[PDB]
Amino acid sequence: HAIGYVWNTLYGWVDTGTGSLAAANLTARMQPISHHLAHPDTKRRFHELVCASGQIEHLTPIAAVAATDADILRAHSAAHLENMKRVSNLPTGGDTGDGITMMGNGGLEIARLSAGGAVELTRRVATGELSAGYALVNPPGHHAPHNAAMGFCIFNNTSVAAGYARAVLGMERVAILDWDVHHGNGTQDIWWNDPSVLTISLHQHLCFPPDSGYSTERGAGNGHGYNINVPLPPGSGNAAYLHAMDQVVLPALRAYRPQLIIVGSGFDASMLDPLARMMVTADGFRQMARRTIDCAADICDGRIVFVQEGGYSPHYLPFCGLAVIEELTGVRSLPDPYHEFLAGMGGNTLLDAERAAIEEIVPLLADI
Amino acid sequence: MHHHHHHAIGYVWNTLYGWVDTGTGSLAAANLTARMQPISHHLAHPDTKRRFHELVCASGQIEHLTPIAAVAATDADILRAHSAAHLENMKRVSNLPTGGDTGDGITMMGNGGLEIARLSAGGAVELTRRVATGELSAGYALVNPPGHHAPHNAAMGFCIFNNTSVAAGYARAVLGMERVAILDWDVHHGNGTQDIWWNDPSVLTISLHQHLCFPPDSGYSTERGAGNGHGYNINVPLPPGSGNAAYLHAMDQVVLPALRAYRPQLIIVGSGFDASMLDPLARMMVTADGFRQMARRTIDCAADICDGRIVFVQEGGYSPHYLPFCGLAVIEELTGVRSLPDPYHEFLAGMGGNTLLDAERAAIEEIVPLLADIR
Ligand SMILES: COC(=O)[C@H](Cc1ccc(Br)cc1)NC(=O)CCCCCCC(=O)NO
Ligand SMILES: COC(=O)[C@H](Cc1ccc(Br)cc1)NC(=O)CCCCCCC(=O)NO
Ligand SMILES: [Cl-]
Ligand SMILES: [K+]
Ligand SMILES: [K+]
Ligand SMILES: [K+]
Ligand SMILES: [K+]
Ligand SMILES: [Zn+2]
Ligand SMILES: [Zn+2]
Ligand SMILES: [Zn+2]
């Protein structure tokens, strides 16, 4: 089966400045650093591993096409789009609104290519040209709500893709499964009132954004029951994540019957990620991808599009990401070289608090 | 500003601590067959600790510190904590043209790397000596390479010599202290320190750590020492996700009672910051304010029981962004000069770790019965 793969060189050129997360701040005594948390290198190393592993030979490279204004407006307000144009047109770019998420001059180009990468892959998987794909995009998306950029996200890539599959490809139902460790508040916002896009987020409870991602956030109106948050406790590893998959996510998808499953695929739930406290290993992500791809095979003719979200371990992210790619190609050519080191650390036993957190969500399936 | 409210607080930073060659790998070596791409910043790159030093300076804290030169630990110093075989092996590895593998396949010394290892251990010793004479009331030795994994007869987990054990050995043998406590709050088990003082009740070793984080299969509460040393090793393994609340409960329910029961003449803290909320090498949720409170508690304990004699010795910690602020917070508790906020405080404050969870309470409670056997 033909597996689409998007990497655009510019994805690795996203300028993350000289700060750690916020900018270098002299009065705060936040010393400048050359590797920002969100530095594009982590995602670049993933791409390079896809290549150096030989996975790329089993992949069909798909060129990103710049997401058009029409594309973006299917997920975002006109005001946000205008604002991003405004910010990117600034001489040296600037603040997109949150004081953290920066765009350099002409940075809109990369934002368009990131969203457009998700769209082009979605387009080609929906035509049946490809069976599935991974769009290794950057900047990420899931924090961008309808009317803003946020949390390194300029546009909500997966929502742009979903909105494309809905409006252009005429699909009635699309699901976005987001397993980036942070809450997909942006995706939740965009599709809040809309039952034609089921939005599911697995995330460390209150990791980022603050005060966001409670399971009580279920959508509104016609969209009520079509947003599912699965907030998990810090220290949740493979057992908790797979339990979440098996108890909530896959039942949710099966209940909902999407024509397309889009995965907001971050790897910041990994054992080694600085930006959360979760204990997922490459094998955990492998199993999560395997489960979702199989579900897609069962319920929507295998139509599944992975779209890169977060993840901040330049050491370990590439192997987490590679594991996902291997599940897509079915070519398994490399061990996770950290497996031995991480295997004894824990996370593979479903703890009672993990179980309880997931069980809280099971009643919500009834409303799908 | 020349009227200070603190006594002399020692501070050790030697330039070479920032020059430890960590190579081109992430954690183990970059390995082409495994397709582990080389990387410019190894997890344990010295920049993280250098950034801590530069923040000590740039914040103005250095103006409230008494800079203390590291002196190279002598063979005699090292030998109070390590075997002649280990010392000789480190000399052998450091004499190799490009140095090499110290034994475990990850812990490397370049040629002449022994000089830095002696300076790291010697930094802890020098500070300890100068607190002991009363010249300094307390101090922070911002040493590198770290120590706590190195047992009597090996280098391990980036540790060449067990710096705090070298310091404690010196306090025992040279300063004639009868009892020394080593409190190790680096997030990983202090297996090395535990090993060194296993049979010896004259050094109380306490480790708080993420359960089985590193080393594997190490750091159980059943590891209690042996012979006359039985009851004088205390492991407090904690669940992943443990934050300020668990750590401070650990301090209050186990650590401080342990120290009070033991009555050391000196407290040495193996001070890592890898339990921080943003560290890649553990899953703990300690913030700078958590470390502040741990430091405050431990210094106050030292004030109460051993005339304030407390020596902090740097261990691990892998957030170049956040470690400096964790470390700053601790040093501010030494000087009482609280002159800089944690700029990450609000970002991290709502993430959690500030509620003592049942599993966290329960893990700590396991250790409480062990206090009864302390001295
Ligand atoms: C890619 O393989 C590794 O991860 C590498 C080698 C290893 C492999 C397997 C095991 Br079970 C243990 C170690 N492990 C390490 O380099 C472990 C470094 C220890 C980090 C802890 C340092 C610290 O802060 N101690 O307090
Ligand atoms: C020093 O201040 C900060 O750390 C900075 C700003 C901030 C400050 C306070 C709060 Br309550 C929230 C955010 N933090 C962020 O903007 C957080 C963005 C990173 C997390 C999202 C990345 C991701 O992978 N999302 O999926
Ligand atoms: Cl002062
Ligand atoms: K919806
Ligand atoms: K998520
Ligand atoms: K002992
Ligand atoms: K420890
Ligand atoms: Zn994320
Ligand atoms: Zn002063
Ligand atoms: Zn450590």
Of A321, A361, A207, nearest to A275 by C-alpha is A207
Chain Cα centroid distance, residue B39: 26
Interface of A with B in 23-82 (CB under 8 A): 25, 28-31, 33, 35, 37, 45, 48-49, 52-53
Secondary structure (DSSP) of B72-117: PPPHHHHHTTS-HHHHHHHHHHHHSBTBEE-SSSS-EE-TTHHHHH
Instruction: Return the DSSP state at A150.
Output: B
Instruction: Return the DSSP state at A209.
Output: S
Of A274, A266, A153, A197, nearest to B351 by C-alpha is A274
Give yes or no for a contact between A2 and A131, defined as CB atoms under 8 angstroms apart: yes
Helix (H) or strand (E) holding A304: strand A304-308
Classify B53 in phi/psi space as left (phi over 0), alpha (psi -120 to 50) or beta: alpha
Hey, where are the domains in chain B? 1-375
Q: Report chain A residues whose CB lies below 8 A from the CB of B352.
A: 205-206, 234
Q: Report the sign of the C-alpha dihedral through residues B22, B25, B29, B30, in that order.
A: negative
Give me the residues paired with residue B156 across strands: B159
* Cα–Cα dist B311/A270, whole Å: 35
**How many residues belong to chain A?**
368
Interface of A with B in 144-173 (CB under 8 A): none
Active site residue A143: yes
Mapped onto helix, strand or coil, the DSSP state of residue B331 is: helix
CATH assignment, B1-375: 3.40.800.20
Between the CA of A146 and the centroid of ligand 4 the distance, in Å, is 13
Which residue's entry shows tokens 């035509």? A127
* Cα–Cα dist B287/B349, whole Å: 8
Which amino acid is present at A364? L
Give yes or no for a contact between B331 and B64, defined as CB atoms under 8 angstroms apart: no
Give yes or no for a contact between B68 and B56, defined as CB atoms under 8 angstroms apart: no
* Cα–Cα dist B214/B212, whole Å: 6
Mapped onto helix, strand or coil, the DSSP state of residue B177 is: coil
Residue A156 has phi, psi (to 5 degrees) of -85, 90
Experimental technique behind these coordinates: X-ray
* Cα–Cα dist A177/A212, whole Å: 17
Instruction: Return the DSSP state at A67.
Output: P
Binding site listing of B for Zn(2+): 186, 188, 274
Q: Which two tokens stand for residue A133?
A: 């794909």
Cβ-defined contact of B283 to A335 (cutoff 8 Å): no
Instruction: Return the DSSP state at A231.
Output: E
Give yes or no for a contact between B329 and B277, defined as CB atoms under 8 angstroms apart: no
Q: Is A180 annotated as a binding residue?
A: yes
Ligand 2 site-directed mutation target among A14, A95, A100, most atoms within 8 Å of CB = A100
Of B37, B30, B272, nearest to B145 by C-alpha is B272
Secondary structure (DSSP) of B267-294: EEEEE--TTBTT-TT---BB-HHHHHHH
Mapped onto helix, strand or coil, the DSSP state of residue B338 is: coil
Q: Which CATH superfamily is domain A1-368 in?
A: Histone deacetylase domain (3.40.800.20)
* Cα–Cα dist B353/B109, whole Å: 37
Q: Say how many C-beta atoms besides its own lie within 10 A of residue B265's C-beta.
A: 18
Q: Which of B211, B321, B359 sits opposite A21 (nearest CB)?
A: B321
Give me the residues paired with residue B286 across strands: B276
Q: Say how many C-beta atoms besides its own lie within 10 A of residue A98's C-beta.
A: 15
Of A285, A188, A273, nearest to A245 by C-alpha is A285
Q: Which two tokens stand for residue B217?
A: 């299969």
Give yes or no for a contact between A264 and A177, defined as CB atoms under 8 angstroms apart: yes
Give yes or no for a contact between B208 and B291, defined as CB atoms under 8 angstroms apart: no
Q: Which two tokens stand for residue B36?
A: 């582990």
**How far is the CA of B240 from the CAs of A1, A236, A293, B51, in angstroms?**
40, 8, 30, 26
Secondary structure (DSSP) of B11-27: EE--GGGGG---TT-SS
Which residue's entry shows tokens 């409190």? B183
Q: What b/e string do you get for A64-95 counting C-beta neighbours within 10 Å, with b at 16 or more?
A: bbbbeeebbbbbbeeebbebbeebbeeeebbe
Residue B334 has phi, psi (to 5 degrees) of -75, -45
Single out the catalytic residue among B45, B53, B86, B149: B149
Of B86, B95, B101, B88, nearest to B154 by C-alpha is B86
Which residue's entry shows tokens 């709502």? B350
**How far is the CA of A234 from the CAs of A177, A204, A283, B208, in angstroms?**
20, 6, 19, 18
Cβ-defined contact of B37 to A48 (cutoff 8 Å): yes
Q: Which of A37, A52, A313 sits opposite B35 (nearest CB)?
A: A52
CA dihedral A287, A293, A296, A302 (to 10 degrees): -160
Residue A40, preceding bond cis, omega within 30 degrees?
A: no
Give yes or no for a contact between B183 and B313, defined as CB atoms under 8 angstroms apart: no
* Cα–Cα dist A291/A301, whole Å: 14
Q: Which two tokens stand for residue A84?
A: 């991003």
- Edge-to-edge strands of the sheet including A174-178? A60-61, A3-6, A132-135, A304-308, A260-265, A174-178, A197-204, A227-232
Contacts of B222 (CB under 8 A, 6+ apart): none
Give yes or no for a contact between B205 and B288, defined as CB atoms under 8 angstroms apart: no
* Cα–Cα dist B205/B203, whole Å: 6
Q: Say how many C-beta atoms besides its own lie within 10 A of residue B190's C-beta.
A: 35
